[PDB]
Every structure is written in C-alpha cells, then in structure tokens.
Design a protein around this ligand. Structure first.
Ligand SMILES: C[C@@H]1O[C@@H](O)[C@@H](O)[C@H](O)[C@@H]1O
Ligand SMILES: C[C@@H]1O[C@@H](O)[C@@H](O)[C@H](O)[C@@H]1O
Ligand SMILES: C[C@@H]1O[C@@H](O)[C@@H](O)[C@H](O)[C@@H]1O
Lengths: 335, 335, 335, 335, 335, 335
C-alpha cells in the first residue's frame, strides 16, 4: 500500500481536539476538570441538558482551516487528525444521524471537519479522523458502564448521572456509532488515518465490524490499535508515552491504551500534547519548549515512531499563541 | 456626608473589568498583549473594524450578577466598581448615545451594568462605576494624542492607527464623554463611587464639568483622583500600589497616576489585581495567594486605605476559578 | 372644549388589555390566576427572571390593528383605550426609557401602540392610553408596598418576592413613571383619554405632576379618576360597576376605585368586560350575551355614563371569537 | 410475547395530541372548528401557504417532556402514545424526508418525539407513536379523496382546496408515508404501540406493507386496528367509545372506526379525551370529573380494555391545568 | 410513450435560471461578466470562500412560484424547466448530500424547486429540471479540467483558481453528481424533462449511469442530448440556435452543444433567451421584441422543434418587467 | 467663512442616493417607475405596509464606505452628500425619533450615515447630508398635499393612498422633521453641506426654523436653496440642469427647483446623474461617457458652478460598474 509506505516515513503530524468542552476550558461553575479539559462533563457530571447550552455560545469567529493547515505544513507535519466526535458525543461535522452537531445546533452553522478536509487537500497534507466509538455521554447506551472500577480523568467512563437504568452498548453501536462512522468515512474524501479511542466496552465482533466498514469505505485508511480487540493496522502508544531507549529498541491486553503491542507492518505513533491537556484548558500554561518538542520528535522518529502532536483550539477557534510559538520554534531548530 | 463616613470604614471592595477584550484574553492573531490584556487593541493596533467583530462572539451564557455580588459579599467586600466603558470605547450598558454597546451590538442583548446594579441593591452592597473619560479608541477625537512621549501598556494612548489626522478631544468630550456620563449617572440608581482614569488630555475645566455633572446627578457619589486636575473627593493610588510604611503613614502632578496626593477628607484607595492583569488573560496564572491578599488588605487598611480588588471576568462571564479560590481563601484567613 | 362635548355623547368605547400575561392565559406551572389573568405574576409570585422568558414566545402573527379598529367601528364604538403598560411593567410600545418592551425584547419587534394609533386615526376613532402609574412589578420601587393590608386579585400589590428591601416610590416615579408618561403622550399623536389605575401609593403632588404633564403634552386629553388624589377630568366607576337606578340618578375616598365621585364636567365611564377577565384567560368562557351587553350599554348611557367595554387579546393577537360574536350580536340589537 | 402480556395488563396510558393546530386552539380568523380543533385546517379550508405561517409562532417555552412523563407515571399510566404527524401533515420530529416539521421549520428547533422518547425511557414508561398514514393535507396525493360522501369533523377528508386535480395516494404512500414510518420506527428506540388512523384510502397491500415494515423495524410493536384492512394486533374502539356491559362482555368493516372487531390476541383499547377535543381547544372547558375518569377506567378495565386518555397540549407546550387536575384527581380516588 | 407524443406537440416552454449569480447580476468588484452572467464566478475567478458570502444576501421576498407559472400558462407554455444546480454548484433545492443549497445556507430557508413543482402541478404544466452534471466550481473534482484549450464564457471550464492540484471527475461523480441527481429525480414528483449540460468530461459509462438512474426513478422523463455520449431521448440544439430552413428541414460529435444530432423519436428543442443572458444581468437590456419571439416560435414549431424560452429571475426572485412584457406581447400576436 | 471660500473652489462632489427603493430598482409587481426609481412608492402607490417588507431584503454585503470615498477622492471630488432620508421617509442612520431606519429595521443593523461620515473624515473629504424636510410618505402629515395640481415623477407629492384624511404638515414638522434634522446635525461630526429638497408645503417660518437649527448645531454648514422661502446660503439649480453659457454667465419663485435665484455669496451647484436616475434603476443603462462628464464639469466650473454628481448605489451597496468606469474615465481626461 501507498499509505503504509507513506506512514512509515511521515514522522510528524498535527492532532486537533476541539468541541464544546473547549469553551469551558477546564472549569465549570467554579470547579475544576483534571488536566483533561475535554473530560469536564464526566469529571463534574454536567447534565446533558446543561452541557447543551454551550452550543449557544459556540461562534468561533477566528477559526480558519487554511491558516491551521498552513501552520502544520510550515512545521513539516505531513498529516492532520481531528476530533469528529469526542466522548461528550457532540459531532464537529454535519451529521444527518444526529442533530447534536456543530452545523445544526450552533450559530456557527459550519461543518468544521469539511473545512479542515478541504484545507488539507489543497495544501497536500493527509487527513485523519478521531472518533469516540465506545464512550458517548450523550447516549444512554454509550460505553463505559462495565469499567467503573478503573479510575478515569472524569468520574465514570459512561454518563452515569443522566442515565441510570439498564444499558446495552449494542443499541448505541447500531443506531449512532456505525451510522456516524459511515458518514465521516463517506463525506470528507480520502481518509488516511482513523483514530479510535478507549475501547472499554465494544466486543471483538464490534471492533471487527468497524474495521471492515472503514476498509469498505476507505480501503487505504490505516486504523489505530485503540479500535480495540486487536483489529488495527498500527499501534498507538499511551497518551504522551515517550519510551526509554531500551523499550523503544525492543517493542498483551488489546484493550489497554499504554505500552507496545504487536505491529505486523512495523507502524507506530505516539500522540502527545504541547502542554498537558488535549482540549484547551485556560489554566494550563505548562507549554513544552521548542527544544523539548524537537528532541521528542527526534527520539520517537529515530526508533520508527511517528509523533502526532496535538493542538487544542480555544473557544474562538484559535491555535493558542504559546502553542504556535512552540511549534514554530521547534521548526526553527531543524537543520 | 454618609458616603464619606461609609467609605472611610468600607476597607474592601470588588472591581470588575469586563469587555470585548476579555474574549481575546491577552492574545490576537498569534501575538501577545502586555500584562494588560484590556490594552490589547492598542498594543497590537487592532483596527476598529476588526475589533468590532468580537461583538458577534459575545454571548456569555454563564454571566450571573447575583452570584458575582454574592461572592463579593461573602468575602466581606462592601462595594463593587464595574467598567461601564474602558479605553476601547465599548459600553457595557444600554447607551442611547452610542450603539457600540453590549445591549445593541451583541447577541447577549442585555444591560450588564443594569443587572449588576440591581444585584448590588438586593444584596445591600454599594455600587460604583468606572468610565474611561479621556481615552476612547473607538472615537477619532479620543484622548491620548498629546501623551505619546510617555510609554504605555499598549503602543499609543490614543487610537493612532485608524485615526491619523487632526484631533480635538473637545468634540469627543461634548458628543460622547459627557452624554455617556449622564447616562450612567442617571439610569442605574444611587452611585457611591465614580472611577475615572488616565487623565492624559482633558482640561481643568473639562474635569470640573464632569465633577459638577456627577454631583448634580449623584450628590453622594465620591469621585476618585484620576478625574484629573485636582477635581476629586478621594485619592486613587497607583495600580497595585502598596506604599511603604512611612509613606503610608505621612501621605504634585494632579494628572499622574502614581503616589499620594492631598485628600482633605482623608480618603484613599488602592485598586489592585489578583493576578497581574485587569482584563482576563489566558496567559496570566500568577495568582496571589490568600495570605498575600490578606496581608495586603491588612496593611492598606491599618493606614486608612481601602483595598479595591479586581476580578477580570472571562469570555463566558465567569469569575476565574483561581480568582474565586484566592478570594475565599483570604476570607478564611480572617480568624 | 371639543373633547368634553365629544366624550359626553361618545357612549361606547373599546378597551384593550394585551401583554405577556395574555400568553399565560390565566395559568402558570399548573396553578391558576384568579378571575384576573393579568394579575398572574402577583398571584403566583413569578420572579421577574422567569416571567421575562415570555418575551421569547411573543410573536403574535395574527395581530391586526386595522381589523381590531374596524370591529370597534362597526359596533359603534367611538374610541379605543389600550394598555401601554400594565402592572407587570412591560411596555407595549417602543420605550427608550426601558428596554423591557414589546419592540426591543420580543421577536415581534413592532410598536403595538404605534400601530393602534395609526389605525384609529385612519378610521376616525379617538385614541386613549392606559398606563399603570403606581404598580410596577418590574421595578424595586414600584408602588403598592404600603397597601398590603388590603387583599388583591394577586398576593401583594407590589412585587414583594423579587424585592424585599427598603422601597421608595419617589425613585420609580422619577426614573420610569414620568419619563414613560412623557413618551406615550408625545409619540402617538392626539390622545383623547388617559386611563390611570389603582393609585395605592402616589402623593397628591405626584398625581398633580402627572396631570400637569399630560395637559402640557395633550391639552385636550381627558384624565380618569384613578390618577388619584382628585386629579382628574372624569369619573371611572368600579370594575364592571353598573349602578342601581337611584345611584345612577344622583351620583368620598379619592383613591378608592368603587362608586361615584364628584365630576365638575358631568363626565362618567364604566369600564367592563365581556367575560369576567381583563386579560385573556383560557378558562373564562362566561361571555355575556348580546342582550346583556345591549342592556348594560342602554342603562349606563341613559344616565350619561359611557360604556368602555374591554377585549383581552389572545397570545396570537386575536379578538377571541366569542368576544367578537358578543359585540356584533349587541350591535345587531340596536335596530 | 412479552409485549402481548404487558399490554393486556397495562390498563391505562396517556395519549398526546400536539401540533400547529394547538396554537389556533379551535378558532381561525373569527371562525370556529367543530369540537375537533385538530381538524381546523379542513374545517375552514386553510390554504397550506397560510397554515404554514403558524411555524413562526411555534416557540413553546414551557414544553417539558420529563414533567409530562412524570404526570403520566404518577397517574399509573404505563405507556404514552404521541402524534408524530397528524392529518395536517406536520411532523413533530426531525424528518429528513420532509422539512415541514417542528425541528427544521420552527424557532423551537427541537425534536419533540426525541425528547418524549428519552423521557419515557428514563421513567420506565413504554413509548408509542401516532401517525396519520392515510390523510395528509400537506400532500397533493394525501388520502381522503374517495370518501367525501361521508361526513367529517372538517369539510373533506383530503385537502381539496389547495389540490383540486387528479390524485393518486400511491405516490404519497411511496414518497412520504412509508419513508416517514421508517424514520419514526428507526430513530426513537423501542416502540411498543403503533397508532394509525382513519384508513379511508389505503389498500390491503398498503396496510400490509406498513404492517411488515413496522414489524421488521420494531418486532415487538403492537399495531392498532385503524391501520385498516384487518392488518393489526389489537382493536381500537371508537373515539371515546365506552361500550355497554353486554357488548363489552361479548365483543365487520375493517376500515370503520366504531365498534368491536375480532382480536386473535384478546387485545382492546379505547382512546378517549378529558374534555371533548383531541387537540387543545380554547373554548372547550367541558372537562370530565375525577369520578367520571375513574369510573370509565374501572369499566373498561374490568372487561380487559385499556384506557388511552388523551391530553392536548397548548401552544406553550403545557398540559392544561384542568386536564392535570382531572388526572391527579382520578388517581387520588384509587385506594 | 405519453411523454413522447406530448413533447412533440408541446411547442413552447419556459426555462428558469436562478441562483447566487443572479444577485451579482453580471458584475463583481467593478468587473464585468461576459453577458453570460451565470458564468461570473469563472469569468472573474471568484474564490468559493468569497462567492459563498452571497448566501447571506439571498432573501428574495418577491419570489412567487404560482405567479411565475401563471405567466407561463397565459403565454401558452406547456412546461417549465428550472436550474436545480448550475455550474457554480449551488443547489436551489433542499439537498441532504450538500448543505451548499438555498434551503440550508440562506435566510430564505425555502425549497425553490419544491415550490415550483407544486405550482406546475396545480396549474397542469409539466415540470423539468436542469442539472449541471459535469461542471461544478464548488467541487475540487468538478469537470472541465480537460477542456481548457476551448474558449468559454468564463476563463476555465473548471474551478482552476481554488483547486490547483490533481483532479479526477470520478470522485465528484460518485459523491455529489449521482446522489444529487437521485435527490431531484426522487423528491419533486413526476419529471417530464431532464436538462443536462456541457458534457466536457464525463465518460460514456457515466452518461449511461445517469441515463439509467433517471429512468429508474422517472420512467417517463425525456433526457436531452447534453447528457453527452449519445445517451439521450431528444436533441437540444445550440444556445439560441435558430436553424436555417434547409438544416431545420433535414436534421457527429455527441459531446458538442451546437447543431443537429440523430433523434430516433423525432424530438428537438431549442433553448433561447429573451435578452442575451441566461442568468439575470443588469447590463443586458437587449430584449427581443414580441414580433421576434413570435417569429422564432413559429419557425421552430413548423419544423417540429420546441422553443424553450428562458427567464433569468432577479435577486428578488422577480421576472424582469421587460421580459414579462416581451412574453405577453408575443402571446398577443397569436390571433 | 472658511466653508464659503472652500465651496467656491470645491468644483466637484459626489452625491449618493441609497435606500429601500434601490432594491426595487425601478420596478414593482410588473410595473415601472419613471426614470425616477426613488419615486416608485408614489408612482405605484405602494402601501407603507407592503413597502416596509423591503427592510427584510436589505443586507448589502458589498457596502464599503471607505471604498466609495476612495473612488470619490481618486476622481478629485472634494465632498460627498448622502441621502439621510428621502421622500419615502426611511432613515439611513440610527434615528431614536423613528425606528423606520436602516439600523433598527433591517438585518444589516448598521448606521450607513455614520460609516460614510467616518470614511470622509479619514480621507479628508467634506461631508454633506440630504434630507427630505417636506415630503415624507411614511407620515400621515407629510408634505405635498397642497401641490397635486403640479405633475410629479410619481402620482401625488404626498402619500395620498395610505392617508386620506385631514392633513397638517405642522405636526410632522414638529414630531419628525425637526427632531431628525437635530439628530443628523448632532451625531455625525462637522457637516459642510445641507441638501434639502422640494419645498412644496413648509412655511417661511418653518424654513427659517430649520435654517436656524442647522446653524446652531453646524455653524459652518452651507444650506441649499431647496430649504425653500429664500432661507439658504447657496443656490441649487434644477435636476441635471446644465445652463446655457449666457445664463451661466450672468445668473423669482423661491419654492421652485429650476433656474437661478440670487446668491449673495456667489455660490451655485448643479446636482446631476451619470445615467438618468437618482436612485438605482435596473433598466437605466443610459450612462454618460467620460467625455460628457468631463465637459459638463468643465462648463459648470468655468462659470463658478459646482458639479455634484450622483451615484445611485445598488441593492448590494455597490457603485454600479458603469458609473465607476464613467467617473474614472472622466478623471483620466484631466491633463
Ligand atoms: C382519536 C381521533 O382519531 C381520528 O378519528 C382523528 O380524525 C381524530 O380527530 C383524533 O386524532
Ligand atoms: C443554457 C446555457 O447552457 C450552457 O451552454 C451554460 O454554460 C449556459 O451558460 C446556460 O445554462
Ligand atoms: C435630486 C432629486 O431631487 C428631487 O427632484 C427628488 O424628487 C429626486 O428624487 C432626487 O433626490
């Protein structure tokens, strides 16, 4: 495959986390999210009916998909992966399946995924899509309800405060997860990377059904290990996992998110953050320096691991200034 | 006067800075404001036509005047002073003089000063108004154009980038400044404090005209020294000025902002910030500890100086969590 | 005066009650207003913050001022009196004094009083204005707070639930009542009747100040007895008061609403309702018959008392069908 | 089947009629509907272009699906059946097939059926859907055009005033009826009851096609007799038909709406009203007492017939107070 | 077929061009279109991001489909063909495939194709649909990129200014062209004519796939020659081509637009304009006289060729007055 | 005076006509205005209720006051005069007196006069205001009702179709004309020219009262002869009046609009059009050539008459391309 050869040498990409959570920025009614601002809904058990009010404040006048891609491109990033739908269940694309999306429900009334797709295509960057296939806090049957003995960046993995009765992920799988994966893999042109996450609930068969649907719609799309149950083309390491020399040299619970796993094609990627948050967090100014970014990329890359470095856009659709400065500074260090 | 006796023993108040600048939060197009996020328009010479686009993003769904006043009251603050219009010229009340205001120009479509007024009244707090009488970057004849040999938190004191010709503050004084001062001193009930600022341009007679108008409309309102030209009832010290013991014990350019000045009624106030910014700034996490706040208040108060401590509300109308925590922590130190 | 001679022979007019209360139609959250639907805010102590939400639902697409005036005219009514502002304090005209009005605060965005004014003028009917000069539930200093030993159609005469502190009607008088009376007596052409109500609080001097302002702006406007303190040109009898023969034949607490009072010019008017409510009430189907309406009019008129017969428009701006049928039926009985 | 055993013992459910007709409440332009306010468009031959204007007034700020379900549940009702689309053709859910719906065409911009579905699920009530499969006054090929020798609550059964040419129900069946039945049986979770109506036009094969589609999408859904042509799992008796003892004891035109029909599974239901209208009607205050409701339910139930008792929500989305009072009163009579 | 016999005798129809281009009316930023005003995007290389702004100005309050069809009918026209989507790629109907359409993207929020379909049906006119299957300037893979050695009414046939990379029409064919053709041939009732255009890029197989889909959805639809590659039921002559007597008497590059081609069914049609533009152009006042129109129609018709005479609606949705006058004048010349 | 010396040498200015009439562009419901498109409301007796609908279509996305002024400046024009309110009574500025204005009543929600004022000031052009002091079709007492024996570009000079009763200009003078002249002469900075029109009704005293108000607010404003009754500082010739050499060389009904009148300060101006309409008219493509414009200007100027050359902006706020081309071409002919 072309995509396989390409990914092996790609080295460096940009990830984007952006959603209603970005407006709250890590705080809600005087209380804090963890370092995980995108988890605020679970962390503070914000009822859906309250969280939905954020749609009315979502008018990011400074969002510019071309300017974002241009930054990525100047830094030598070869691909961009963006959140189409995170755990809160809010879609950042025009979903016919679900009107809880950025196009229908906000005054912004624009398809953010569509604009980033088009921007990547003109600039020659490959395009990837993040989709939370398991957790969906907007759905009574969203995943996570079997996993609450394991600590999270929130409270429970599922929405356990609005939805307190019998739960069966199979229904959400059928009525929302699969139809939305169909939309994003159909309507945004060629997809090079599919970035799934926290496979806390879905079965082997469900992972497989997703894998086969993605391949039917996007034959060259490379699927990460967090689809779960070993149904994947490349290994995602843990959040900000930068392995020691020895571990990076050598390289299993298929549903854990940490550590190495087998990779028949020799493909690996660490997704990381510039500060310590995925979603934009007001409080978090612990931005890595140009030098650290440069060194992390060099280290990952020389052991054949791609560096997928995340930007959490703010409520106005901006790359934080300190993120842009860190990225452009790392670029300036490259001889 | 009752107001005079009250102010002398008031000790502690809350100041609020809030405006379009709060949405930008210290950055614009990848460049930084100084420590002064509310000066961003001058610091980066943002054309009015661009800055005005912020009105369309101004929908602060979490703004709650009662909850802000309640925090003030729990911390033992006896008065609240809010920005009705800062240097950028944007009014935070329904101005019939000028449609560049929060009621007419934004989807929020509410009178912020009106809501704060009513909240202070129900809670028994005294109400005060900040108004930038000299600088107004939305007006070709706004003040500051004689002062650009003095360094600022921005570039120029005036809007020198949209407006580059002959200037005469007398026109803005007549057509905007005085009619707006009339509005705010007529429509929001009893006003106990009038907080003017940076008298870089206005004449003795202009300062006097303001003083007399405020008194005609608000006989019990105390006017601060920054009205300029010696036309005042109490002395504002410098920004965050905490005077040494022997200066605080003893106590002249009437148009400078720093140091003591004469006060025939023995009234003084230092306005300070919890971090280092007046307006909300994402980048500023340098929040003073409860202990520092407590000690500053004790020191000012034992020399008969009031502590007016500022909160810069964020884009959603909220008291930053770290500000609320610092204030409640200082309160908890009053054993 | 022309107006004096005209009113004596006018015999029959239409009153209109219409406001936010008309949407609720006599119930709120499963609880009933009295027979007085327009008093629902007081009856159920609806916080202003909740009651104001009705502005969002106020889009009465079937309101037609010409059609309403035409009905009046076909029934032989010679004048129309409309609520410009009822006790809830919501203005049904474009008030620059207060944005709590039908033009600024609702999607309808139209001046109802302006449209009715123009309609009366084209059809040749005289125009009159109701204004609640004393009670204003939207104002902390609204009237009624001295009268709560007298039972009402609500709970208290004042808003005693949002505003629980010290009150002084003088402030509302100055800042809202008088400025709004100036607006309505300045902006809507010639006013023939001024209908004030429930003078529970205002002083002799305040009644006089109103009287003199109305005459300065509208020299020929006839003022009713409910301005209070004997400041009036004609006597309003009680709500639906149809006096016995011998009382009607011969004809004192100036601030009560019931019974005869002296009338230097020999002018009298009974305001009444077709059913038992002033504001539209879903529940009230006790519509008087054509015969009753005809007989009430004949009785009042033969003793030189005018009959001002009220329609409460529904939430879509319509004359209820049973009201229209009753009025046209009474008309048909006049030969 | 579980559903069969459940329905036999269910005894008591809530029906909801709600649409644009609810705003008019039984009147339009000074003319009356019959006791059937939901038939107003036919009764008064309101052109589609005029009737559609009601969408602009549809902002029911008091609609609260949780509170409606809670009332049902407290009265011991075990299921709730709601109008997804009545004869006027207006959908009360987000239909991709037709933008003439409450989500796309009104300022309310919400999926009413979706909110009721979610509320039923959290409370543990079963959910049922009414759909007018035959009559559709918004469609040129809507049913009814062969039936106009039979008297209606309106004028004609079809829209005969906008559409006066050759008609063929087969086209509406294919392009609107079947696609919409697919939507409502796909997107709102498990449906326990399907409530079809007035089978004036559809063929045996069309009834069968509907029956089979419902079963394919909702294997356990019980379908009522008004799907027509004998394609049903339970018998709906006539509107408010409370059968005499010996008829109720013993128990054929498959397309009539009155009387008993065979029921293989022994299932029966009478749908009734609290007053005399299905849709909200201002004029109709003829509310049955608690005692009548209790006695009707006891009578129906002791002959193994379910009582499906209708609420017609008003223009603001509320259960009329007198309806709520009647239902809570009947509940109170059950020791 | 019925349609074949009907078309042969139909003689005269109306064409409608209407879109965003109609607002610009032949000019943009002080530069001219060619008198093909609908080509202005290509002629002046207007970036999509700029051209899209026109959606915000699209509120044609005088559009009236019934009045347009009435005009057609009074002139004896037996069918109407309207632009569902022209070269700029903007849909004039509610497309679920693409939100760049008149319903979703403009304040008008109405389905223009839908309203015209309904109007034709009530008046008894046959309905036809224009769709640009090949050129689409809103799509990176839109057609025309192989044809830029042939001169156009614009610059390039494709959008070569926003999209400068690798291009493959197959992708647009699959993702936009075919799904939209399915929409228009499914949702707007019976279609008698399908009017395709400028087959610069699509293959024989693509033409065939379209032809077969149209026939599957619309078995009686007649397809014109500009579908290309010989896949058609009738011949469209060139733009405003009025053939000389001996060519009209006798009657091959299947993908050219000029001249005769074979027609097994003996069906032909010339589409023409009243002035010289398809889309509305301010500059074009060169309106043909009644006499010319009459003579063109008589000439075409006596050789068995239908005359499809275009109206370009203005930005308010109106038939230009001079167009209406020309058409009514031609009608009056038929004694 | 400085203004007098400046105007005498000014030579050349730009006039702007822009309003609701510009959208109709000379046509309404299939009928024509004369070559006076701004007169369409009178010409076709458009009821106010219908004409007001145009506000909903008024969203001129291409309006750019800086670019208009820059064109003026590049042509050597020294001043710009704009319609603040034409005969239709619609204000193009934010009027507190009357909400029938471009700020309050349209989605554009911008102060056109304000933007032009600011643009003139930055570019160094003097600013002037046109105001229809006599005719006002939106006011029952608007002028013209004494003049209907004199032919107009419309039907009657007044609105005689909505308002058919007793009329008295004195009321409109007091309640709209004078208050609005105060607004425009107070809120837009220094005004160099006041351009009044068609003094068909107002008295000498009324003319004088206007003159004296303008001078009180704008001491250096030059007032034209069409204020009427000899109350003026300079003479406006007739519309498009280019006097013969001998009349221009040596130079009375004070209320006629044609021919010379005395000018004690020697000031004269001809206002003309580039085509033959003041307001934008679709049909009017009779644009004068560069040569004609140049020769007109030279002729007027060498006899000491200023040339005030009008642009009628289109519905999108543009200078028509042919007008821009004519003006730039005339400029190019100046050696
Ligand atoms: C239960 C009833 O069913 C049909 O007979 C309708 O025509 C009614 O008006 C109502 O929805
Ligand atoms: C009928 C005409 O056909 C093609 O040749 C288009 O490119 C035209 O500009 C228009 O639609
Ligand atoms: C200069 C012209 O003046 C008058 O004659 C008006 O009636 C015209 O409409 C235009 O404003």
């Amino acid at each position: 495959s072309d995509t396989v050869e390409w990914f092996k040498q790609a080295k460096y990409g940009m990830m984007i986390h952006w959603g209603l959570y970005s407006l709250l920025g890590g705080e809600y009614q005087g209380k804090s999210s963890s370092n995980y601002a995108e988890w605020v809904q679970s962390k503070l058990q914000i009822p859906n009916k309250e969280y939905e009010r954020l749609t009315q404040a979502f008018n990011p006048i400074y969002f510019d998909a071309d300017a974002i891609i241009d930054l990525a491109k100047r830094c030598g990033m070869q691909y961009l992966v963006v959140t189409t739908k995170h755990h809160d269940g809010f879609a950042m694309y025009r979903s016919l399946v679900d009107p809880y999306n950025v196009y229908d429900a906000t005054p912004f009334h624009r398809d953010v995924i569509g604009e980033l797709s088009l921007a990547c295509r003109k600039a020659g960057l490959r395009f990837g899509l993040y989709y939370s296939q398991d957790l969906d806090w907007h759905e009574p049957d969203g995943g996570g309800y079997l996993s609450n003995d394991i600590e999270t960046a929130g409270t429970t993995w599922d929405n356990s405060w609005d939805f307190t009765g019998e739960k069966n992920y199979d229904r959400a799988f059928k009525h929302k997860i699969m139809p939305q994966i169909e939309e994003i893999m159909s309507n945004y042109g060629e997809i090079s990377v599919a970035w799934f996450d926290v496979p806390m609930t879905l079965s082997d068969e469900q992972s497989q059904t997703i894998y086969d649907t993605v391949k039917r719609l996007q034959p060259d799309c490379l699927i990460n290990s967090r689809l779960g149950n070993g149904r994947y083309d490349y290994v995602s390491l843990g959040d900000n996992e930068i392995p020691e020399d020895s571990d990076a040299s050598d390289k299993v619970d298929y549903n854990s998110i940490e550590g190495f796993k087998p990779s028949k094609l020799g493909l690996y990627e660490t997704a990381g953050t510039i500060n310590d948050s995925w979603g934009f967090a007001y409080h978090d100014q612990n931005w890595k320096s140009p030098q650290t970014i440069h060194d992390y990329k060099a280290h990952l890359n020389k052991y054949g691991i791609n560096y997928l470095l995340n930007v959490g856009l703010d409520g106005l659709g901006r790359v934080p200034m300190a993120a842009e400065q860190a990225l452009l500074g790392a670029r300036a260090l490259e001889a």
